[PDB]
Assembly symmetry: C2
Homo-oligomer: 275 residues x 2
Amino acid sequence: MNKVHVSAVGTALLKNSLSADNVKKEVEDLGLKDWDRLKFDDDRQNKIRDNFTTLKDLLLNFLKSKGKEASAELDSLLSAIEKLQHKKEELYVFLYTTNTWNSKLAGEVIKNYLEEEGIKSELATVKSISSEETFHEGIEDLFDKVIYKILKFKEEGKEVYINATAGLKPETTFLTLAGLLAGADLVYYKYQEFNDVVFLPSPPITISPRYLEWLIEFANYGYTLSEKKAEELGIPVRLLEVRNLVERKGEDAYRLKDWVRKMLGIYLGSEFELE
Amino acid sequence: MNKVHVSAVGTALLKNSLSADNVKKEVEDLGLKDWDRLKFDDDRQNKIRDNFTTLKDLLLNFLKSKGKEASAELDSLLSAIEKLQHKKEELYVFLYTTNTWNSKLAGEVIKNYLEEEGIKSELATVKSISSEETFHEGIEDLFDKVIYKILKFKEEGKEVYINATAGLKPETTFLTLAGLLAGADLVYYKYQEFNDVVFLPSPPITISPRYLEWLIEFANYGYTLSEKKAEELGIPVRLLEVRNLVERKGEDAYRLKDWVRKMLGIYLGSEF
């Protein structure tokens, strides 16, 4: 399957499904009125868990009934696949979603629909972003679970298409940029009020070689540099600091920020810190 | 003003302002009940135009009253300014929005509010994206009105912070990517959720140099090349085409897509 689509899955499907009276009955009787908006540690997530199969078949029947438009994910996926003329034999759909029952439900339902339609696909899950503290881990997890998989796909000799329709804005802005750094071929988006997908300018990009040399340099010296050592290596720490590439750690020292190291992994391999 | 913040302006302010009865009254009497969602060619846009100044004063008063929380733009702007400890003296706020009356209204209101708060700013306007056909023009326009300005700011030795909070996904993903290609320093985002700005991974990036050389090559021979010329110059037009950089217009011929032209002829020259 040499043509891979990457798509986040949200819970809009959960919400959209309440249109239908049968779904609204079943969800209301289970106590799950706001199942699209549940927090990751809300107890109602265990009611989705405990009732997974049912809610699955119910959302897949809703989906069959009223068709792909109930999920912006499917709509943009299936529209892009139509417009690019990607054959079912050639296709793979790498879904990811947060590690929460309402999201996994949406994700399993969409996975099964794609498989009923002759499209092989996979659903990875990723850490929730529930605060400023969990955001940076959230992004590292997307690196590990998605960006590094885009890398694998590109080594495998495949074409990668990013579906930017789905996902929260910051998480898809990150996926688009990291995705293209990892060699993704094309980024697409379906406007809610259009039927056709558009192709975002997806130019082939790499970290500035100037900055790539500097950033690899911290790796030689224990990911830290005094101002005097940086200046001797010609590395403008005060500009790296503006660009949130380094943090000042103490009076004289600058440490290469952890997110940069994840991203360097695109260039030096995912396990380069362990060699 | 060494520190520029870039921010789209959406109409969410127009919608949020309906939670004051005076605004909702004036909106309903004027026929403007869904003014946040009006398309670019909707006739109700002329009611905003015809009433611009008064609807300005109305939204600015609502905004003073209830403060920056009424606008994702102000909220994220003022929060990022707070978190980065940028002084008002050193700031310039580059707002852009579509050339539509409901958008310009939101944008003028945000511009005046920032100026009342001692922050200099401009409001650039850009062509509306109303279809597949107008999308590519829309993106060329963002290049001309925003990306090229990010470039100018960076030649001046100013620092550019992109506020990714407001904007539709495709307009903000393009601003982030082309913004960083133009040398923008940092991209930030404020979740409504947890009321606090985060810094998105924003490495300095460039066009792949192999491709930059190929792309500048097309720019020497008009902006079209036969298959026999391309393979002679060692250019995988096959791979340019997959990455939407060239179209096959001609017979055995390839044409450099217009947006690529307007991205070369923004960051790395200004000729042909």
